[PDB]
Amino acid sequence: TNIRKSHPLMKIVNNAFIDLPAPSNISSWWNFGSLLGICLILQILTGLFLAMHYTSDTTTAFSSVTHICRDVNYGWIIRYMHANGASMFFICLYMHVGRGLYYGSYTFLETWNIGVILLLTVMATAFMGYVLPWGQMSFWGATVITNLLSAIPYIGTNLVEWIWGGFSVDKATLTRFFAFHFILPFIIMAIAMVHLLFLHETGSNNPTGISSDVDKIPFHPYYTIKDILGALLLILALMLLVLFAPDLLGDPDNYTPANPLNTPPHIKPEWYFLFAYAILRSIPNKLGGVLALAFSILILALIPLLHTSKQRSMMFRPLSQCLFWALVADLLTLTWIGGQPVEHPYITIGQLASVLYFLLILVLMPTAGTIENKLLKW
Amino acid sequence: MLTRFLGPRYRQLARNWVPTASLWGAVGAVGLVWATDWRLILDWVPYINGK
Amino acid sequence: MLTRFLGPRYRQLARNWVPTASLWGAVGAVGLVWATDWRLILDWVPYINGK
Amino acid sequence: VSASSRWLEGIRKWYYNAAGFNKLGLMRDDTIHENDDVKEAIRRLPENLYDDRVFRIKRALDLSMRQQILPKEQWTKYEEDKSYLEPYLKEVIRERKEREEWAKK
Amino acid sequence: AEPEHDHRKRMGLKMLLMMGLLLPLVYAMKRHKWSVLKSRKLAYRPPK
Amino acid sequence: FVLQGQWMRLCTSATESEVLRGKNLLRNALVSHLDGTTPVCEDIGRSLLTYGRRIPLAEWESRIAEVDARVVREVCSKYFYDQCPAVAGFGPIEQLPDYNRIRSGMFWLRF
Amino acid sequence: VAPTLTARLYSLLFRRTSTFALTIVVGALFFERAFDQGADAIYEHINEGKLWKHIKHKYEN
Amino acid sequence: GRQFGHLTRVRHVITYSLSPFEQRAFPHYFSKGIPNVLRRTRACILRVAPPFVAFYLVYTWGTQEFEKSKRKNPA
Ligand code: HEC
Ligand code: HEC
Ligand SMILES: CCCCCCCCCCCC1=C(O)C(=O)c2scnc2C1=O
Ligand SMILES: COC1=C(OC)C(=O)C(C/C=C(\C)CCC=C(C)C)=C(C)C1=O
């Protein structure tokens, strides 16, 4: 009999990537799962080959990365691959949570809930990541984000200093951070496997939301090869970035060495934080603003409880379909606002998109779901 | 969707697990008090204010 | 403890898998030649000595 | 009897066509989320309805795979759409809610 | 600012010409293996 | 798996010994098949349709005796190796291998 | 010659997974030459005098 | 996990298949393909497009308005 089926190790592989029944049926929106995986190791490999040359002390931390690009043979590809890889890791994250919401995937509680834990974790990693070259975006990166903890009643201050290495952002902050940014992706890899274990328990949801038990197909050869084309297409969208437009999805502020006396006029985080940036400065409360940002993401946790529709997917629900793209566009809106300074229309439209996000998800989509119930006599 | 859990039995069974749940917060806080050496609280405790 | 494997059948079956095993080292070396750009060997190859 | 309840009906027939499960030979009861209450009612379906249900879904997931749709002829007419599951589903929830009241005393 | 400039644009051309071979070929490889599934014909044949 | 891996073993690495077994098995089938008026008559009638002769038992022995391991690996590889099969399946057939995977079974990567 | 050649390819080179692999490996060496030639030469032709490979003759020895 | 043979119960369904070495990978790719993508877009525009044009007009207005706001004319 087949060695592939019974050998204790090969067993695991075969049950996950060879003989595993996938739907006949799942589409490109399913490719993001694997490309997220492909992103995690591509980040691990370049991230490693970078760590071989980088140094984590402030007085040298800029100069080391420069060293990498210019002197370290191919340190440029190895680095801009790593830097673009990260945004690419974000295009995949957002698309994957896109698919998850549209199609009802959140129903699988522990899987999505693990996946929420995955998102925070990879957010936290990529933040730590751009801090490391010790640019302008880095410093006020490390400043503003940590300082969020200061908004905690009675204890926030102490924590903000405790993670900082004392009294403001310093030497003790970069070393600290480099270590965290190294250990977290391996931790991510552990949790992604837990995520997978929970997934493969149910197997995959599909574009219809109806159970595909009735038409399953073996992962190999179909989704090994659909997955490869997918992976290639990721390498295209990655290599286009690194080889033609390396600087596009980054701030040029990070190319100026960190000055704890500046804080530049046209400040912002990385693009994948721009939606969130918008949300937090739309409130003239410290306490309110941060509590808006928390709820910006830890909202995903609530989504399952707000499921309302007698159907799983959105595939046959045009009301919900509409309010969905309203959400995407609204998020594009907030990305764009995040990208503009805190001045005239920008302020009000930004407050509105903030209200709209929390409206669509908290109130508008559950109602829309219920109306379609009553429309189907259900 | 928690309408299910509202009836005579449920209130009996909550009323059952109340002294226990009381003590579990006693355990949890006093542990946090001790583990952080909360200053603010511990000044009240004779013997333990060692200053 | 390999006495087991010495008999007419085994030699037939080795003699069967010989042209294949021949070619598999052809695959493996020429791949290593190409992947390291082995210099020493590749000078012999017309076209491919690009210097 | 009514101009207006023929209109709520026209709104309903709209949304039906608009949802477009019909377009893949599906019926409304093919499309229901499987929870425990639903799962059991599928268990309770007689042989033929079950076999018909599995075929409808099989045909649809096939189309869904090939990104296609039926001939308009072969779509499911709103009027021709049988809530074959409804009574079972209702009986299940009915039985569950009993167990739930009993669990309360 | 960027001495790699012309090296990266050189690799880019290759990347573009390479993807230009591989993408149709990887596509042709998938389209093949799914061809079984894409052309499968169902018939339902219940009693009565 | 096992049926397919058999075909392939025989395509690639048929040993000498088993082929003598098959040869004997075939001889035994043949003589034993032609037992009494009805089989022999049916074989007269059919043969004349399909060969234009009756092929005498000795000729079959000759034709059998020629075959050995090479004649197997050759004639198997010609018909079996890396060839699209026809599959028919009936009854509780959830686990009947996908056609691609069956057709993958029709060659070894090691060979 | 123009039809029965994919055939001729398949018999001689593609049946055996050895000769298959040998073909891809032997075939890749020859391809890496012809590509890094052609494409470099395409990249040459699109600059023609921007690059130190063309300037070379200016500042001698 | 869950394994073939043990998935679900299915009766009376004949699948006819074809070997990929018997058939086209790209069959009527533009003949039939282009008609489908049109049909699929047609199918989805009114759900997908309006929020993004809604974004479009709020972006080009907010741009127009912001920089016009940083101006005077009298006094
Ligand atoms: C996508 C999340 C992510 C993962 C996973 C990740 N990195 Fe990074 N890392 C980044 C980002 C973002 C940067 C900053 C890119 C930039 O702006 O230069 C970065 C930068 C770095 C740098 C400094 C050089 C540079 O380009 O700035 C090192 C060193 C590094 N990472 C090591 C690692 C190691 C080791 C791993 C594997 C544990 C890892 N990275 C995985 C996000 C990540
Ligand atoms: C906020 C939720 C969420 C996040 C973030 C998330 N996952 Fe998932 N993931 C899911 C759910 C839910 C599915 C279920 C797929 C389905 O049935 O449509 C899933 C599917 C998958 C799959 C199966 C392939 C597929 O997409 O169907 C893989 C693999 C995967 N995730 C890995 C990842 C990786 C790696 C990350 C990044 C660390 C991650 N996931 C991020 C919730 C998420
Ligand atoms: C999961 C752990 C939480 C970490 C996730 C980070 C959330 C991103 C929000 C962006 C915050 C941010 C600011 O608010 C801000 O003013 C500046 S100026 C440079 N970077 C930032 C910056 O990054
Ligand atoms: C049917 O659903 C599935 C997919 O198709 C949508 C996949 O493509 C993958 C592929 C997973 C990869 C490559 C893992 C990479 C991640 C790590 C942490 C090594 C899995 C497991 C899966 O279940």
Plain-language structure description:
This is part of a larger assembly, with eight protein chains of seven kinds. Chain A has one domain (1-378): Up-down Bundle (Cytochrome Bc1 Complex, Chain C). Chain A is built from 14 helices and two strands; from the N terminus they run H-H-E-H-H-H-H-H-H-H-E-H-H-H-H-H. Chain A has helices at 3-6, 8-18, 32-51, 58-70, 75-102, 109-131, 136-147, 156-164, 171-202, 219-244, 274-281, 286-297, 318-338, 344-376, and strands at residues 21-23, 216-218. A two-stranded antiparallel ribbon of chain A has the order 1-2. Chain B has 51 residues and is mostly helical. Chain B contains three helices and no strands. Chain H is built from one helix and one strand, in the order E-H. The longest helix of chain H is centred in the last third of the chain and has 36 residues, at 33-68. Chain H is elongated, with a radius of gyration of 27 Å. The chains are: A mainly alpha (378), B mainly alpha (51), D mainly alpha (105), E mainly alpha (48), F mainly alpha (111), G mainly alpha (61), H mainly alpha (75). Chain A binds chain H through residues 15-16, 19-21, 200-201, 203, 211, 213-214, 216, 218, 318, 321-322, 324-326, 328-330, 332-333, 336, 340, 343-346, 349, and chain H through 1-4, 7-8, 10, 46-48, 50-52, 54-55, 58-59, 61-62, 65-66, 69-70. Strand 1 (41-44) of chain E pairs antiparallel with strand 1 of chain H. Bound molecules: heme C (2 copies), 6-hydroxy-5-undecyl-1,3-benzothiazole-4,7-dione and ubiquinone-2. 6-hydroxy-5-undecyl-1,3-benzothiazole-4,7-dione binds next to helix 6, helix 7 and helix 11 of chain A. Chain F: It is found in: Mitochondrion inner membrane. Chain F: Its main location: mitochondrion. Chain F: One of its GO terms (cellular component) is mitochondrial inner membrane. Chain F: It comes from Bos taurus (Bovine).
Give the helix/strand layout.
The structure is cut from a larger assembly and holds eight protein chains of seven kinds.
Chain A: H1 3-6, H2 8-18, E1 21-23, H3 32-51, H4 58-70, H5 75-102, H6 109-131, H7 136-147, H8 156-164, H9 171-202, E2 216-218, H10 219-244, H11 274-281, H12 286-297, H13 318-338, H14 344-376
Helix pairs in contact in A: 3-5, 3-9, 3-10, 4-5, 5-6, 5-10, 6-7, 6-9, 11-12, 11-13, 13-14
Chain B: H1 8-16, H2 18-36, H3 39-42
Chain H: E1 13-16, H1 33-68
Subcellular location (chain D): Mitochondrion inner membrane
Family (chain D): Belongs to the UQCRB/QCR7 family.
Protein name (chain D): Cytochrome b-c1 complex subunit 7
Keywords:
part of a larger assembly, 8 chains, A: 378 residues, mainly alpha, two-stranded antiparallel ribbon, 14 helices, H: 75 residues, Single alpha-helices involved in coiled-coils or other helix-helix interfaces, binds heme C, binds 6-hydroxy-5-undecyl-1,3-benzothiazole-4,7-dione, binds ubiquinone-2
Give the ordered list of helices and strands of chain H.
EH
**Computed structural class of chain H:** mainly alpha
Q: Output the CATH topology of chain H.
A: Single alpha-helices involved in coiled-coils or other helix-helix interfaces
Q: Proportion of β residues of chain F?
A: under 5%
Q: Any idea of the CATH class of chain H?
A: Mainly Alpha
PDB class: oxidoreductase
Keywords: cytochrome bc1, Qo inhibitor, membrane protein, electron transport, oxidoreductase
Entry title: Crystal Structure Analysis of Bovine Bc1 with UHDBT
Chain A: Cytochrome b
